[PDB]
Write a protein that binds this ligand. Structure first.
Ligand SMILES: O=c1c(-c2ccc(O)cc2)coc2cc(O)cc(O)c12
Lengths: 194, 195
């Protein structure tokens, strides 16, 4: 129903205000204006609710990432993928999610891994498949595509998660282009043949 | 002595991590340390100043656990050693309480947040950068800016681990750490070694 989404938005609000364990299914029901019966019918448990929230946001973020195409040019394809990757830190729920899960002090490993595999690791895999294509075409060289994808993302991302968390990141579109161009230049120094 | 300053420091640290920075008052700190407000405010003009001392102290300390890398040891071994000590910090979560305390302020204390950044993380970059200048001067690496290069080295080696640790999905044997480092270094050198 339309209640499912109202519940979702109400739960998100509380998880972010208070944390996951500090939010009760009781509080969620009240904030969404439904009976516990209704709530538990749509979601078997708090853990199931948060899982839905995770998969939904992560599938969403993933379709805002381009599928990079070699036909667009090696540099432009990476540059574009990088640009979308960084816009998603700054303007999406990834840091929030990590904050919420980290605050659980390791007591929900299944959710923690679900987030990891649905978001960050998924991003790595998509990029990796592009990097396989580039290696097959002899325009990059490296031993493992996932390792290389992760290196590219580490370079481009750099230090920003920390800066964001400290509340010091203020990134104009121009400052982002510079971040990307530095990371890419380096990535290509290491992986382009000569 | 008037080392009381240290008792106050430890008492404030305790409260900041129990309750948060804003939730802790100079009044509570005085009581927990067993001094008058007069004594307290004589040593520290404000709560912000007290936290700044804590920050500078903990950051200087973490910095001494890092080696000063030496070209005589070999380029690779020197970096490898620096990397190893750098990751130790993350793995044993030596930064985490501080970051928690600052992050939980939701950006209301930007001067302290920057003080932490410049005393810790940025300091690490600067140390490495000075080593990389020497390596460049010795013609064994090439790159345009030493801070940029230092930051790139550290981003490579660090990669994804901070995230994994925070999520509670990392358990890193010594061997797994060597592999993390070797991967980051191999790459760093592919990009910066001549030929
Ligand atoms: O690396 C991080 C960190 C982290 C924490 C401390 C650091 O010094 C660097 C990164 C925090 O949240 C994330 C969140 C992410 O989605 C991906 C990441 O790679 C990270």
């Amino acid at each position: 129903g339309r209640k499912m989404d109202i519940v979702i938005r109400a739960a998100w609000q509380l998880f972010l205000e208070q944390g996951f364990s500090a939010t009760s299914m009781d509080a969620i029901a009240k904030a969404a204006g439904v009976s516990k019966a209704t709530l538990y019918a749509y979601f078997p448990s708090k853990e199931a609710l948060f899982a839905s929230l995770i998969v939904a946001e992560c599938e969403s973020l993933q379709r805002d990432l381009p599928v990079p195409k070699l036909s667009a040019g090696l540099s432009e394809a990476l540059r574009d993928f990088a640009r979308q990757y960084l816009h998603t830190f700054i303007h999406r729920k990834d840091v929030a999610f990590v904050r919420i899960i980290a605050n659980e002090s390791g007591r929900f490993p299944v959710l923690a891994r679900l987030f990891y595999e649905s978001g960050p690791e998924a991003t790595i895999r998509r990029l990796a498949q592009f990097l396989e294509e580039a290696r097959a075409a002899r325009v990059l060289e490296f031993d493992d595509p996932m390792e290389a994808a992760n290196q590219f993302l580490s370079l481009v991302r750099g230090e920003l998660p920390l800066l964001i968390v400290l509340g010091l990141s203020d990134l104009t579109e121009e400052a982002i282009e510079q971040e990307i161009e530095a990371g890419l230049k380096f990535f290509l120094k290491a992986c382009q043949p000569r």
